[PDB]
Amino acid sequence: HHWGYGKHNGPEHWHKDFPIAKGERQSPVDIDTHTAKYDPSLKPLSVSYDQATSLRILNNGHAFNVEFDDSQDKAVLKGGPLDGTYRLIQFHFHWGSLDGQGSEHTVDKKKYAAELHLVHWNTKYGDFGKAVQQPDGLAVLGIFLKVGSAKPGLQKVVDVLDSIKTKGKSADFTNFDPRGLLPESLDYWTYPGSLTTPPLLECVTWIVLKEPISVSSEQVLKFRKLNFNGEGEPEELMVDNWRPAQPLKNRQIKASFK
Ligand SMILES: NS(=O)(=O)c1ccc(C(=O)NCC(F)(F)C(F)(F)F)cc1
Numbered sequence: 449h450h451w452g453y454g455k456h457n458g459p460e461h462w463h464k465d466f467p468i469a470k471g472e473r474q475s476p477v478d479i480d481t482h483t484a485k486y487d488p489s490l491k492p493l494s495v496s497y498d499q500a501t502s503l504r505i506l507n508n509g510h511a512f513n514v515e516f517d518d519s520q521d522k523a524v525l526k527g528g529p530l531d532g533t534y535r536l537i538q539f540h541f542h543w544g545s546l547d548g549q550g551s552e553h554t555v556d557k558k559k560y561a562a563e564l565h566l567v568h569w570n571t572k573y574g575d576f577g578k579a580v581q582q583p584d585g586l587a588v589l590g591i592f593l594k595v596g597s598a599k600p601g602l603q604k605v606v607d608v609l610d611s612i613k614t615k616g617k618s619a620d621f622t623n624f625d626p627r628g629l630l631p632e633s634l635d636y637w638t639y640p641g642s643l644t645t646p647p648l649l650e651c652v653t654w655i656v657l658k659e660p661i662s663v664s665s666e667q668v669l670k671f672r673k674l675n676f677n678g679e680g681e682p683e684e685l686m687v688d689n690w691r692p693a694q695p696l697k698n699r700q701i702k703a704s705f706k
C-alpha cells in the first residue's frame with residue numbers, strides 16, 4: 449500500500465503522509481464563474497506544439513501518461529499569465545466511473561466526465577525535478593471532456609490502452625500530435641494551485657480552458673477498462689481517479705474573457 453483513490457487510501461487520507469494537502473494553494477478548485485474576475489491585462493495563451501515529440505505511454509497505477517521529449521524547447525506553452533517558456537513533459541487524464549463525474553476542477557459545481565492535464569515545466573529551472581520545488585515551476589493546461597461526438601485526435605490514445613492495461617506497463621507512442629486534443633477556443637481561467645496528486649506540491653499555475661472537448665461514450669468507456677493493479681493482481685478498474693475540489697482560501701481566479 450501507498451496512496452490511491454480507494455476508501456482506504458484515497459484523497460481524505462493523503463494529508464497524513466503529505467500534510468501540504470491542507471495547505472493554502474491546493475488544487476483542484478471549483479471555478480465560480482460569477483466570482484472569477486475578468487482580467488483584460490491577461491495575454492493570449494501561446495500553445496506551440498508543432499514540434500512536439502511524443503515518446504511513450506505508461507500506466508503508472510493512477511493514470512496513464514503520454515510522455516514527450518523535453519530535452520529542448522520543442523512543445524512549449526508561453527504567454528497568458530506565464531513568464532517565460534514552459535516545456536511540455538507529459539499529459540494524462542482523470543475520469544469517472546459514470547459520465548456525471550470525473551473532472552477535478554468543476555465549473556459552478558458542474559462536473560465533467562473527464563479532465564485532460566497537459567503538464568509543462570519552467571525552463572528557467574533546468575529540469576522538471578527542480579521546477580516542482582518552485583512556486584512558479586509548472587504550468588498545467590486543463591481541458592474538460594464532455595461525452596458526445598468522438599474526438600478523432602483522441603482515438604490513437606484509446607487504441608493503445610489495451611497494451612498498457614495494468615500498472616507499470618508501457619508502450620512506444622511516437623508521432624502523437626497533442627494539437628488534436630485542443631478545443632477551438634483558448635479562452636481560459638487561471639489561478640495559482642498545486643499538483644492534484646501526492647506529493648501535492650504548490651508549484652502550479654493552473655490554466656483551465658473554458659471550452660470542453662467532446663469525446664464519445666465508446667472512447668471514455670476504454671479509459672474505464674484500464675486497471676489500477678499490476679498484472680496478475682486482483683483486478684481494480686481504473687476509475688474515479690480525481691481529487692475533489694479544495695477550498696479556494698486566499699486566492700483569486702482570473703478570466704481571460706468577458
Ligand atoms: N494532476 S496534475 O496536477 O496535473 C499533476 C502533474 C504532474 C505530477 C507529477 O509530476 N508528479 C510526480 C511528482 F510530483 F510526484 C514528482 F515529484 F514530480 F515526482 C503530478 C500531478
Ligand SMILES: [Zn+2]
Pocket residue numbers: 540541542565644
Ligand atoms: Zn492531473
